Amino acid sequence: HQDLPLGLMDDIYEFSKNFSLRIDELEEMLTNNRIWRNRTVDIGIVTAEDALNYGFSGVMLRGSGIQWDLRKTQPYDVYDQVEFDVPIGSRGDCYDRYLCRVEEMRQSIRIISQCLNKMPPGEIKVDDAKVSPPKRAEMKTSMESLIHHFKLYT
Amino acid sequence: ASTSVKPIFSRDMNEAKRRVRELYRAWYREVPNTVHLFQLDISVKQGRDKVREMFKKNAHITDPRVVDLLVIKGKMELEETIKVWKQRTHVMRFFHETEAPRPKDFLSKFYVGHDP
Amino acid sequence: ASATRFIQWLRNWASGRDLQAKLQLRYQEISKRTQPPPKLPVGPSHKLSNNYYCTR
Amino acid sequence: TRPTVRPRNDVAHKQLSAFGEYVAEILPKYVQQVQVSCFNELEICIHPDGVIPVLTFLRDHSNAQFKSLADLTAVDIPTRQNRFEIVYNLLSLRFNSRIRVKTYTDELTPIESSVPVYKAANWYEREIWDMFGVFFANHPDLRRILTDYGFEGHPFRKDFPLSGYVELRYDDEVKRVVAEPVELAQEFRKFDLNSPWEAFPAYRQPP
Amino acid sequence: GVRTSPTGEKVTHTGQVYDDGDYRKVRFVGRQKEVNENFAIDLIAEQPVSQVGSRVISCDGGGGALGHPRVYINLDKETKTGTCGYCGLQFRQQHH
Amino acid sequence: ASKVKQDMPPVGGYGPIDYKRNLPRRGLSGYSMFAVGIGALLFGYW
Amino acid sequence: LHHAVIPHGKGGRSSVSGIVATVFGATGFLGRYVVNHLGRMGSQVIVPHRCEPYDTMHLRPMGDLGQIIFMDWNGRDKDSIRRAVEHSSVVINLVGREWETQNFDFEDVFVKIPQAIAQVSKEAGVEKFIHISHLNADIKSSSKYLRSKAVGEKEVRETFPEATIIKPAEIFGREDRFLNYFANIRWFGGVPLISLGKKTVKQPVYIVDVTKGIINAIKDPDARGKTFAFVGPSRYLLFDLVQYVFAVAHRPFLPYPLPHFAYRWIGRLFEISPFEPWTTRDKVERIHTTDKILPHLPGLEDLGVEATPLELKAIEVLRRHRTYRWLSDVQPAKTIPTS
Amino acid sequence: SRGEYVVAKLDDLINWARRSSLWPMTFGLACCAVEMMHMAAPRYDMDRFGVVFRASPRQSDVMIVAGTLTNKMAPALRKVYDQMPEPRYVVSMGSCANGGGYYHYSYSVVRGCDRIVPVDIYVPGCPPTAEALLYGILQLQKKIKREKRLRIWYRR
Amino acid sequence: PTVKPPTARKFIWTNHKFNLSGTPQQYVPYSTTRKKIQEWVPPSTPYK
Amino acid sequence: TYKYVNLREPSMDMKSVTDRAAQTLLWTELIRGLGMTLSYLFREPATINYPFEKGPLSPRFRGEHALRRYPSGEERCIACKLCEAVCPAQAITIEAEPRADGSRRTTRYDIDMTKCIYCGFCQEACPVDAIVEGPNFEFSTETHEELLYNKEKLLNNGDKWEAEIAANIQADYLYR
């Protein structure tokens, strides 16, 4: 709908710079804890074939070892220009799917870093007034840009 | 032929009207302990009268496939009252204890509003 | 960031890491709340010629 | 390429068309129509009597291997004699492709349940029965899933009003939540937005 | 410019006022009737009329892209005054 | 008549961002901890 | 009447019925049902309350947005009465109290306040007026409660000549003080009764029957300036009636006699409390007063309502006095022949 | 000197106790439950106003309805309200719980929780920001501060 | 405001009010339009 | 590219097994967990002192509504009903008629703040910036009725918040 306000991509960098430590503090409490492991290890075991035949998707397939992530197999937008890894489980239980999600938080920081650097300039909505509305400056000075504004919102 | 149509459970009315009776037996032998678990304030008498009314309204049907659905839906409405998935309010929504009468005589409808 | 040195050492020792360089509270590294007005670009259809709609 | 036009994929268009004839040749008994949309989707239309033979083929055949039921839903078109339109969306991780299989039925005609082929279809078929009234034969458990208990109707059909027929409140006389005919403080306002000018000459029907 | 009715109920710029025996006046007992004091029709008729030296003058509400769609007004008629359809300001031609 | 000004990354890009797991390793060997525990007892018993 | 608010709709929650009602004393047991019916049919109900706004909260769900209106009033400020009735078309008075207080007694609540409401309403222009009295109302009864209603009932008809007066009997219901009262005597051991409950005949009436009757008087024009007497379908003997209560409650029943004078003694030490008295000397008399059989006053049937039997809706009230949830039929109480 | 003053001060104490120890029961049903959790997060920390994160229905005082109240769920909401010990207050949070919100015209949505339980405060928004809700809870305290439960007893 | 004061106008309030809910100054909604259908007032002069 | 999350096998040498035995018997790992919470016992809490402190916002924020005016005093709304036709929740009702001075102006404008989802489409479609979502977010009410705004309440909000609404648009009208 609008372009990013000036001074936003800097704040995202400040947040992304310190987030990775917060994940580490999360893992200290849970990953190697014996109490947390006993409530997630060998719990909810799902076989690879059952996951596919029950319609499971996401970490419910990867957690069981199936290598599949739509961002890399059927890419949309510009997910074909960012490098990241897809965490994969080996056991297929609650603990493994908890490690995929915690790992997916680290690969998101990895992707967010690249998006900040590789952001290109230009417009932010399709330059076609019959699908996306025109700017308010133009809607108030051109008769074509007012008709299309009138009919896109009514 | 277009008239030929796949059946649901029963291939003709004689076979279809058997299920209506078997379904009716289930309801008649379920009100007394329905009124007990749900702690309703209606006697088993008028509880059983209600089931009589519901069947009697679907008495003009003559299509075996329409009757099968009215039984299939009837069985579902029973599984909810035996497994107590329905709450006290759901079972008492048949008896309409909060809707004022809507008279059928012409003058009463004429006095109140424009509807027929 | 106002923690005395002894507390800084104790928090750092307990956690096993240097927490002072990655504070979760923001002090002055945030961008200013008022910014110079922008002037955004215009799309590739802002041409006065060779821009008939039927070709796009 | 133009900066505001989605580019074509002719390579995918040919491959899916080739696979469309492959299925049509292996199942002449059930396949009635086969399309490929301009954005490269493959739709297979089959007689309703071929839900299991055509799904079991795609789920097991080596050159198909569609081992995941993405979704299952029905579309209501009142004008057609068989109003309802059952739709299957399958996925193939082996070949990284998707196929959509469509069939149909009407109010009183059963459609064979596909739970034996896809266990994911268990709950989906309950949703179709609850919202559309289609009855699936041999379903292990067919019950309302979304609607309120004792709800009479099938909301997603095109002739069930948006506001329903009954509404709930709490009447203190009986100390329970009761149901009464629907009255609205502000009627939903119907807008006639369709323009009277043909928008797309490409999709013009014959007179 | 409120025109309080005889019973003591203020009249809004739209002209709404409950009659003497309308039961709907009970909603104000113990409370107040929200009325906007500044009337639009009394603040735009107290503006000076602008004198311009051309047959067509264009108004855009003042403030550029923060006003209203720019329109062009014809001042050829001596009897009356040109009037912006959006903002209500008036323009007149100097002498011809 | 200024140029186009919109939010963009600063020239030279942003500094590196860490994301990998960095759980530190600490403590004594398993043998040593037993030695202190066993030794703590014997002084206690004595 | 050139305004004549015009009914619209299907008689539901969002409809308009044209009845602008001021229900005095609507925060109590009898008020809950009258406000509920008026609002359930889309009516403009003004609810003057003396209590705190918290106690009126249960009334808010009983009407559409803007229908139930709450005002603050005092029984001794006629200006607060007029502010609540100048815009209305019907005034219903349900004000009452089972006990006296340092501030309000039986003379004030049953005579002075009802008299003030009628005088203010008449000048304000209200065309209707519904008053509630008691069936056993007379000026020669030991009870002070029943003496003050007979006086007040007469003053209403000399101040509002068109007023409608209703004379129900002891009304039973979920929040009542008649059936719940008897069930609560289980705390003190036995169940004392003057004499042994014989020679006492009562004719209780269901709350909804009273509530449905009051509304009808607001619609039909034949109820103006007329007196009624809402009574139940059957007459019971007080001992049999109380025995039935403990039967549904499924609790021990050990009635024992108590002299009339002795029953008044205990009623004096139970009314010393600065809170809701458990029992009062006045309460003992009314529990042992034989409901009149006035046959010349129209009843519920004359207003289209049908009386509800006690047996049908008795398990509803007493369900919570039982000490077990399910308890796996109680014989109907002996009924005096109508004759 | 007058008893009114003795009972006016004594009413302030009970008002103070009931306003400084609100124990809410969150009926988190939809998105509006996320903003409720944020209000309990470090930044706002409802717990420092005496408002505990969560409680059981019979240890609770205020019910926060945060989400869309469907017909299927309405019977359960009323039952919990009936079992809450008094005094009890309901805070209606979000457009869905006030008058229906986005789904006003749905066949399955109850067009406002005020049709099922009484409401003491309405917090608008979609969702109401975590700070907007904290304005509703504080505005609820000022309602309890104005209550005159003991005064009205003394003048019956 | 001390540095960049707001623009001043005649219609802007000079006395900001706070949340007035619960007090007598609260806002009570009403319809701002006029009556749509007008009734027929019979003549006040008796006939015959 | 993928990576294995839990594929490393544990060692089976004498030192390794004793480390796992010492961990089990001496509760070593759990004592490490107590350390992290101890650090948070000596960190400055992130709690702001509401209502004397406030959470940060931006000029784009969407709060309570308000009908604006021109610098003169005339209403900006010319009763075009574009906002009414884009409102996802149908929370706006508008009626209009010629004024005594022959101008296109409204005689009814109500926003049902209980139906409204605070989405911003009404101010994107208004061609004259008449309806805006102000920066206020503190308008909790005690009754349902007083959340059904009409033209008077909205016009008061314009006359009440014009100082801040006009500033916010000045800081944001170049992006939109």
Ligand SMILES: NC(=O)C1=CN([C@@H]2O[C@H](COP(=O)(O)OP(=O)(O)OC[C@H]3O[C@@H](n4cnc5c(N)ncnc54)[C@H](OP(=O)(O)O)[C@@H]3O)[C@@H](O)[C@H]2O)C=CC1
């Ligand atoms: N219920 C029965 O069995 C019988 C009822 N009636 C008659 O019905 C009427 C009462 O019915 P009921 O609902 O059970 O009575 P309630 O005990 O439930 O309360 C009566 C109402 O009147 C109000 N009230 C009492 N005194 C005053 C006062 N000085 N000033 C203002 N308000 C006052 C009370 O307000 P608040 O409590 O908020 O202070 C209350 O809301 C009486 O006239 C009674 O004679 C007739 C026959 C039998």
Ligand code: SF4
């Ligand atoms: S009001 Fe908005 S945020 Fe809250 S439940 Fe409804 S849609 Fe979700």
Ligand code: SF4
């Ligand atoms: S914010 Fe969205 S839902 Fe609310 S009034 Fe504006 S357009 Fe309608």
Ligand code: SF4
């Ligand atoms: S507020 Fe704006 S969009 Fe809505 S009717 Fe008025 S001028 Fe048109």
Ligand SMILES: [Zn+2]
């Ligand atoms: Zn203009």
